[PDB]
Amino acid sequence: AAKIRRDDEVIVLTGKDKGKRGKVKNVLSSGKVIVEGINLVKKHQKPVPALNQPGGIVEKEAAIQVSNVAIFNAATGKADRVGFRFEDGKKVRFFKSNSETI
Amino acid sequence: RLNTLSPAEGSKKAGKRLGRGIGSGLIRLSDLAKVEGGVVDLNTLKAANIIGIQIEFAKVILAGEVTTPVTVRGLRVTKGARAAIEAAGGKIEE
Amino acid sequence: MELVLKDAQSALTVSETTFGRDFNEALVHQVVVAYAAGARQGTRAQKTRAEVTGSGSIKSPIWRSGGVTFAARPQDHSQKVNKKMYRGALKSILSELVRQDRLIVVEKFSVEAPKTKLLAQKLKDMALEDVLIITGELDENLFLAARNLHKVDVRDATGIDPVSLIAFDKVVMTADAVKQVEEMLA
RNA sequence: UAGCGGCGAGCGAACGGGGAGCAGCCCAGAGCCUGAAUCAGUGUGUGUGUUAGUGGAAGCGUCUGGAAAGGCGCGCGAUACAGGGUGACAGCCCCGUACACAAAAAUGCACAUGCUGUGAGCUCGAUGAGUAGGGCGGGACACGUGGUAUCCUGUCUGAAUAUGGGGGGACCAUCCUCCAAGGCUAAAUACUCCUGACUGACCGAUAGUGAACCAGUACCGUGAGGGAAAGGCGAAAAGAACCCCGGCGAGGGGAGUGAAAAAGAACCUGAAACCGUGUACGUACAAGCAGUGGGAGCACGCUUAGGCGUGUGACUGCGUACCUUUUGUAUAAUGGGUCAGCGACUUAUAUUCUGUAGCAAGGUUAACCGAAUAGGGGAGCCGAAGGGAAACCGAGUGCGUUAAGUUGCAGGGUAUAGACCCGAAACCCGGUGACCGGGAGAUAGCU
C-alpha cells in the first residue's frame, strides 16, 4: 500500500482541515502521516535542565490518519483516488479521472 | 407480515415454578383385508410384518359387525364363523 | 384459480385445492417455529463443580469462582416436521399469497449477460425493489449477478424455503417454475 | 424384549431386513514360453495444493455540527453492499472483498516413463501329521476336585487326509456346512496436543479456562499440593508552558492545552450503606416496635388572600418486629449487622393425561442417500372386529358389540440419571513423611 509516499502534496478530507492542502513530511508504521501546517498543536514542553531547552511553548505538528488525507492532483485541481499498474521497468502510481500519470 | 401471526389459543403454557412469587398462587378380519394378496393363510404372515417375527400361530378371530366378506382357508374354521361371516355373503370353510 | 401473467395473457390453470385452501394460522406457526428451531446451533456449555479446576467444599457453586449449580450440556433444539404438515403449510402460504395478490408470475425471467446493471434496470422497469426471485433450472447469468443485491435472492424449486416467502413482500415466479412446484408439492 | 432374575430388586439375546465398501488371495509344484499384468527404488516432463505475493469498481454541496460515516439533493460500480480501521452509523477515505494471476527451491499427490529388483497366462497334484481326541498329577466356573461341559499344563497314547475327518438336527435313523491343525489383506469404524478458516438466539469481568491484567505469578506449605485479587484517561499525551503557596516534598490553586480537566494519570458513566458542610423545621418537664388519622405552629413557591403543594411535626385515639417447626410464641424453642453482586425444579430415555394442528381407517418414518430443514427411503412401529389361561369357543363368551386411531408442538404427573439447593463420620488406590489427588457433586438419617 504505497498510495502515499514522501514528498507529495496531500489534502485532508475529514476533520478540522477540509480544503487545506500540504506536503507530507513522512509516514509512520501505523499509517499516520505528518503534513506541515495542517493541524497545529500547542504542546507544552516540560522544563529539562539539559539538552539545551529553548524554553516556552513549542509549535509542532501532530499525527493525522492517512484515511483523512488523499493525494491532490494539482492538474485537475480536485482530490482523487490512485491506482497501480505495471510498466516496462517498474510499477508506479497513477491518479484516477482519465488516469493522469505521475 | 411476519408480525401478524399467532398460535392457537391454549396451545402455550408457561408452567408452574414453585417458590418464586409469594402472590403467584402456590389376525383380525379387518387386518389384511386388502393388501394386494391378503389371502387368509399361514403364508406371507412373516413377509407382511403384521404379527411380530417369530409368531407362527394364526387365527381369524372376529367380533360381530361383519364388514369384510373374506373367504378363509387353511386356518382353524369352526361353526362359529359360519353364523357370523356368512351374514355378509362370504364363505368360510377349512 | 387462473392467474394472469400481465405480460402475455397466458394464465396457467392450477389446482383449486392447492391455491384455494383456507389459511391455517396454526400450521404456518408450527412450521415457522420448527424451521427456526432447526436453524439453532447447539453450541453452549459450562463446567460444574465436578469438572471445575481446583480441589476440595470450596468448589461448590455457592462459593465464589465455583461451578454452576444449573449447568446445561450442549443440545440440539431441532425437531422433525411431518412431510404432510410441511406440504399443507406450503399450500396454505401459497393460497394466502395469491389471495392478496402478492405473487407475481412471468413467462421467463432471464438476463442475457451476468451484468448487475441490467438486472437493476429490469427490476426498475418492473417497479420492484425488494422482492423474491424464484425460478426453475438455475441460470448462471442470473444467479451470478444477484448475490450482491441483498434484497434480491435467486434460488431453485428444490430450495423453496417457506420462511423466505414471508420475509419478502412480493414473490416473482416463472412459467416453468410454477408447474415444477405444483407437480413436486402434489 | 426373548431370556435371566430369593422368578424379587435388578441384569440383559439371537435371526431378518434397510444403510458405505465389499476382496479374497499367496505357499506347501512341476510342465510350455516369457523377465508380457502388478508391486517398490532411481532421474526427465505435465497438471494440481502450501511456504513469500500482484492486479482488483465507483461522491460531492448544504444543516446540526469538536470533528460526519448522520439528515437533505443530485450521480456511479457491483462476477465485489462478507469484515475491519477511519474525531458520530462508510459500497464509492484506506486494508480487504467476488474475480483474474504468481515460484529459483522445498516439496505431497496423479500420470509416458529409461534403468534397477520379485514377478505373464493354461494344465493337472495339495489340503496344513505327535493334529484332534483320550488319560494321569494340579488350578478357575454357588461349589471341600464335583455328575463337570469348557479352559490353563509337567507328562503318556493317538487315524484318516474326497477310498477321508469334524460340527449341527433327528430318541435313533435321515438330512445340511467346511477343507480343521500355514500365512496376508487400504476401504467404510472412534478421537484431537497442534495448525487455517468457518458458526455461535454461549459469556461480556463475583460470569466465561484458575489466569482477557507479564498466572499456574504473588502467596500458603520442608515435602506432594493448594492458589488468588488486579484490565477501560484522552479521537489524537495534544500529559497542565508558566505563575503562587508549600518543606527547592506530597497535596494543591490560577492560567493555558484540551468539546469537555463534573477527562489530570489512582484519569468513562460512579449505586447503596457509611462520612461531613449549608439550608427549613422540631427537640433541654418528658417515658415504651418510634408508626399511623387528625393536627396548631413554623419557612419557601403558588390560588400574586381563596382555606393549594412542598419541608418539620407540640398534642391527641390506637399501636407487644421478620423466617421455621410447634395448637400456637420477642415473651425464657429457633437465626439474621448494612449495602452492591453471586445462588437454586432445566435437561436425556421411557410411561400417563390435557390443549393444540392436520390426516383419517389409516397414521407413520429410523439409519442412510441427498441440489443437505427440499425430496427420496414403507427398514420399522401404532391402531382400525369379543373376551374366556392355552386347547377350544367364535356375538357370542362372569366379560363385550358397530364412536377412531396415529403422528409433531406446549404443558400437568411417575420411574431411571445426583436431579430444587447447602451441610457428615468411615473405606480403597497412587504418592509425600501424619499429609496430598482420585473413587465422590459418595452414601443413610436429620436441620
Coordinates of C-alpha atoms (C1' of nucleotides) in Angstrom, one line a residue, chain C residues 84, chain D residues 359-364 381-384 404-406:
Chain C
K84 CA -47.7 -33.9 5.1
Chain D
rC359 C1' -54.5 -36.9 8.2
rA360 C1' -58.1 -40.5 8.9
rA361 C1' -59.3 -46.5 8.7
rG362 C1' -55.2 -45.4 8.0
rG363 C1' -51.2 -42.9 10.7
rU364 C1' -46.0 -43.2 10.2
rC381 C1' -43.6 -49.0 14.8
rC382 C1' -49.0 -48.0 16.4
rG383 C1' -54.1 -48.6 15.5
rA384 C1' -58.5 -49.9 12.7
rA404 C1' -61.3 -43.6 15.6
rG405 C1' -56.9 -44.0 15.8
rU406 C1' -51.8 -42.3 14.9

